[PDB]
Design a protein around this ligand. Structure first.
Ligand SMILES: [Mg+2]
Ligand SMILES: [Mg+2]
Ligand SMILES: [Mg+2]
Ligand SMILES: [Mg+2]
Ligand SMILES: [Mg+2]
Ligand SMILES: [Mg+2]
Ligand SMILES: [Mg+2]
Ligand SMILES: [Mg+2]
Ligand SMILES: [Mg+2]
Ligand SMILES: [Zn+2]
Lengths: 45, 107, 97, 122, 95, 136, 23, 85, 116
RNA sequence: AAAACUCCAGUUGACACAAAAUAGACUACGAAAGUGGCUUUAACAUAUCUGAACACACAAUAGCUAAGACCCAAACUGGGAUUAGAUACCCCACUAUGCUUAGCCCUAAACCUCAACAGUUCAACAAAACUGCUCGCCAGAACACUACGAGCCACAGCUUAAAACUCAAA
């Protein structure tokens, strides 16, 4: 069952052909890893 | 000295290695992973070559081959790092224990 | 005849359980200028401070309702082979009767 | 095993940034890497001033990439990134989620130790 | 006989305390969370007694802080003035 | 409501001084030591405005490292600053010393307005090896 | 505890060093 | 140096309360544990007697915390003797 | 709040090395350290400073130094009366902190025991 | 206080083979010595115990050999103060050296002075008393971390280690 996840993800993995579009899509998009937490333990962004 | 392209120890019983992509086969090849998987493959090879009952780690011969593979690992580490005295001591003690258990098995 | 095990199993304390944050009614037996000692249940009496509000209405036999934290205040310190005690119990009141 | 390159470039425009990125991933593939994904953290003014190979930089562009490669490729790419001029910094690291978190049962209360000094009058 | 006690576990046992993030995950990129656990004026990170979390998480976050500082995600002297406007967890007294 | 932290060049700073923004305010730098203290005033763009010290005021070996001399130097520097047309000042203090606290009060008695105080004292993270321990 | 014996040893070692320096 | 100026270890004066500002600065520096570090870096501290001093400080903190626990736990009892006889 | 001391000392059952090496035995005693002075009195520094200022301004002219000289006298007087007031304050008892002698009385009423 | 520097001092901008605050009130790893900046790699023995001072391998700091490195500190040295004198504690400058390489030396209060292994609940002080097995060591003080002998890349060294005379103590 574990093999199945990274199996289908190969198509998600970029290549020499998908690069010329994934690079642009990623640099146009934005991503953030930051997130805080309160006294109880509830996440807040 | 097993080949690099040989997939990991765990991913052998699965029958999906034939239809799976060559990129996945390369990813699962032990050359990507550390030397631990290489020595695992070596241990399995020795167990299948010599031992009558495989996957029996409690056996003296299994312990001996494990220590021999570890000895080769330490020897390579030392020829790449002539100065690692900790690994030097470990190699010496490993060969001593190997001689000890060889005597016991001979008895 | 009644067995002591049965009296324990039906006792008020076995059903009381932990004393932390549990209401209970009690009365006083001795009182000082600024404080009063309530006998409520179990072994020890709990000390308390007279509130400026309703301070006049505190005399012998007064039934006051209050919570509590423990039944005996103790603590084991660094060189304490056995825990030391205070011979009291912390209890705070928020109403009477 | 998995490897994340956290990289910070100097502030410049999309065409040359894309050129740098494609050249870098080409170097990855040359070393034999397999790229998992690319993530743009965004453009930010780096916290403290630094000194590049020949100048100083008060801003930067944060990128990250996740890939798979053997070991030698690691230091080969490190020296590649050091030789590259327009790249401010780049660091290879392992992946955190690859190391499964040990199951936690919470904080245990530590009782005060005793019997350190034997009983006597002193 | 039946009224006698029996060998039995403690049901009154309250669940073991878990820190703010005993189960959650942390990485050197969550600069917001990593700067939540540091003094804003000096920039030096607080200890366990001030923070209120387990040693494993403390070690993880301090190592991540060092990594971020050295690579460039974080400064060392001054806490980021953009992330201090966040919930205050670590107890203090000077204010 | 008051913010103890200082403003940032990035907006927004809702507090000015003499109708001026925080950054362009002149900055005073003082270096404290067990033996002596040195004071100086500079513009926001590093133009050296004023400079004085206990030595220039005429304090000798033992007496340079005192608070009275520090506050006198502060008085002098404040006089020079107001002569040159300086009212407000951002304080910067560097290191320990007797006259550390005294120089600021000297400036105040001179008649300047301190807005903030930053202690940019040297802190090595195990960088160099200091002197050996002397036996008093 | 007392260190008189090791002071004796100290003096002996010092004198021996001086002796070898002379000879 | 490379870091920005006038952010860290600063205090904004209000109503010209320079004494309060400086006192708060010293207080925060001590709670962060700095001035001790400056006076330790002034003259060199050998590793051995450094470790000795630090172990002594740890033990002192432990003893003081235990005595403070006892004090805070028994100060409630310090009251007028209710039972004379 | 207190840090634990499981295996920090040199005990026979502890395999590893010791963390601590306390010179004196680590036991809570029934005697508390009595307080101590903080520093030596100093005051009127700014007063005498402005006094010397107006002195060197007016060549030792009392009718001109009046302000500085009176302020200095008043500050010294206030310092003396404050010393007396805080002395009687320490004698009658410091508020907010408990006194050593009565703390010791309480501790001997509720003493620690290392022994049984 | 003196001597010393003013090619001095302060802000600002650029810069290291140097040592790695805070975390750390944490007690983890390594057989031990030791190890607490960051990253990667390799890797952290033995699933009965003991066990070589006839061997093997490590072994802090210091020191030696030949190249290099120069922020800082500093033996030695020189100068200035103190002192009756100061070949020292105080102050200033610099060097071996502390650092990186390829070797050597193999010593410590190398002590937590408490041996490994499997277990249990009283001399004094110290860190409570003990059981079973095993190795090593000890037998009045001092002469003695000594002489002689033997081995060592060591040559003012290291390891092993007595003897003669003296005393009633130590
Ligand atoms: Mg001692
Ligand atoms: Mg520390
Ligand atoms: Mg050397
Ligand atoms: Mg040198
Ligand atoms: Mg040691
Ligand atoms: Mg020994
Ligand atoms: Mg043994
Ligand atoms: Mg010797
Ligand atoms: Mg010899
Ligand atoms: Zn936790």
């Amino acid at each position: 069952r574990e093999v199945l996840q990274l199996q289908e993800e190969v198509k998600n993995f970029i290549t020499r052909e998908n690069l010329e579009a994934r690079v642009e899509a990623a640099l146009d998009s934005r991503k953030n890893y930051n997130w805080a937490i309160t006294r109880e333990g509830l996440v807040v962004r | 000295d097993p080949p690099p392209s040989t997939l990991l120890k765990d991913y052998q019983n699965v029958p999906g290695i034939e239809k799976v992509d060559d990129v996945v086969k390369r990813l699962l090849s032990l050359e990507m992973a550390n030397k631990k998987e290489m020595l695992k493959i070596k241990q399995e090879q020795f167990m299948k070559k010599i031992v009558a009952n495989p996957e029996d780690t409690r056996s003296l011969e299994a312990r001996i081959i494990a220590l021999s593979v570890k000895i080769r690992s330490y020897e390579e580490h030392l020829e790449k790092h002539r100065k690692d005295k900790a690994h030097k001591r470990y190699l010496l003690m490993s060969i001593d224990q190997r001689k000890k258990m060889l005597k016991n098995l001979r008895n | 005849v009644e067995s002591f095990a049965s009296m324990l199993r039906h006792s008020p304390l076995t059903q009381m359980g932990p004393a932390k944050d549990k209401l209970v009614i009690g009365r006083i037996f001795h009182i000082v200028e600024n404080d009063l000692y309530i006998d409520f249940g179990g072994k020890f009496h709990c000390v308390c401070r007279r509130p400026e509000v309703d301070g006049e209405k505190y005399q012998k036999g007064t039934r006051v309702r209050l919570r509590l934290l423990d039944l005996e205040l103790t603590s084991r310190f660094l060189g304490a082979t056995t825990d030391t005690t205070v011979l009291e119990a912390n209890a705070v009141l928020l109403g009477i009767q | 095993p998995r490897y994340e390159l956290a990289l910070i470039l100097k502030a410049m425009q999309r065409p040359e940034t894309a050129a740098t990125l494609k050249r870098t991933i080409e170097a990855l593939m040359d070393r034999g890497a397999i790229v998992r994904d690319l993530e743009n953290l965004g453009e930010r003014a780096l916290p403290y001033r630094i000194s590049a190979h020949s100048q100083q930089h008060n801003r930067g562009g944060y990128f990250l990439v996740d890939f798979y490669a053997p070991t030698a490729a690691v230091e080969s790419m490190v020296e590649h990134l050091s030789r590259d001029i327009d790249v401010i910094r780049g660091n290879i690291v392992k992946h955190p989620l690859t190391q499964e978190l040990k199951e936690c049962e919470g904080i245990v209360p530590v009782p005060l130790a005793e019997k350190l000094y034997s009983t006597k009058k002193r | 006989n039946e009224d006698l006690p029996i060998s039995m576990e403690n049901p009154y046992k309250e669940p073991l305390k878990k820190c703010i993030l005993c189960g959650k995950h942390v990485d050197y990129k969550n600069v917001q969370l990593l700067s939540q656990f540091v003094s804003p004026f000096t920039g030096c990170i607080y200890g366990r007694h001030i923070t209120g979390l387990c040693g494993k998480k403390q070690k993880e976050i301090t190592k991540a802080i060092k990594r971020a500082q050295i690579m460039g995600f974080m400064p060392v002297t001054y806490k980021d003035p953009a992330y201090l406007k966040d919930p205050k967890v670590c107890n203090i007294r000077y204010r | 409501k008051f913010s103890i932290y200082p403003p940032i060049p990035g907006e927004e700073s809702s507090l000015r001084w003499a109708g001026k923004k925080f950054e362009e305010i002149p900055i005073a730098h003082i270096k404290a030591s067990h033996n002596n203290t040195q004071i100086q005033v500079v513009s926001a763009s590093n133009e050296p405005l004023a400079f004085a010290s206990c030595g220039t005021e005429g304090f000798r070996n033992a007496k340079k490292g005192t608070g009275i001399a520090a506050q006198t130097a502060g008085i002098a520097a404040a006089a020079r600053a107001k002569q040159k047309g300086v009212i407000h000042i951002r304080v910067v203090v560097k290191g320990l010393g007797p006259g550390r606290l005294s120089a600021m009060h000297g400036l105040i008695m001179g008649g300047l307005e301190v807005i903030s105080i930053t202690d940019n004292t040297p802190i090595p993270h195990n960088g160099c090896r200091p002197r050996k321990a002397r036996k008093l | 505890k007392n260190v008189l014996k090791i002071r004796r040893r100290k003096m002996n070692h010092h004198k021996y060093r001086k002796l070898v320096k002379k000879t | 140096a490379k870091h920005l100026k006038f952010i860290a270890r600063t205090v904004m004066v209000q109503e010209g309360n320079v004494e309060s500002a400086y006192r708060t600065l010293n207080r925060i520096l001590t709670m962060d544990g700095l001035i001790e570090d400056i006076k330790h870096r002034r003259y060199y501290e050998k590793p051995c007697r450094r470790r000795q001093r630090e172990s002594y400080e740890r033990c002192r903190r432990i003893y003081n915390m235990e005595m403070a626990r006892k004090i805070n736990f028994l100060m409630r009892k310090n009251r007028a003797d209710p039972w004379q006889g | 709040a207190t840090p634990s001391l499981r295996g920090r000392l040199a005990r026979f059952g502890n395999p590893r090395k010791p963390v601590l090496k306390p010179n004196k035995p680590l036991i809570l005693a029934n005697r508390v350290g009595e307080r101590r002075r903080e520093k030596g009195e100093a005051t009127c520094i700014t007063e005498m400073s402005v006094m010397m200022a107006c002195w060197k301004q007016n060549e030792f002219r009392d009718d001109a130094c009046r302000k500085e000289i009176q302020g200095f006298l008043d500050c010294a007087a206030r310092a003396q009366e404050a010393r007396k007031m805080r002395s009687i304050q320490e004698t009658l008892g410091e508020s907010g902190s408990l006194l050593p002698n009565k703390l010791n009385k309480l501790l001997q009423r509720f003493p620690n025991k290392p022994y049984l």
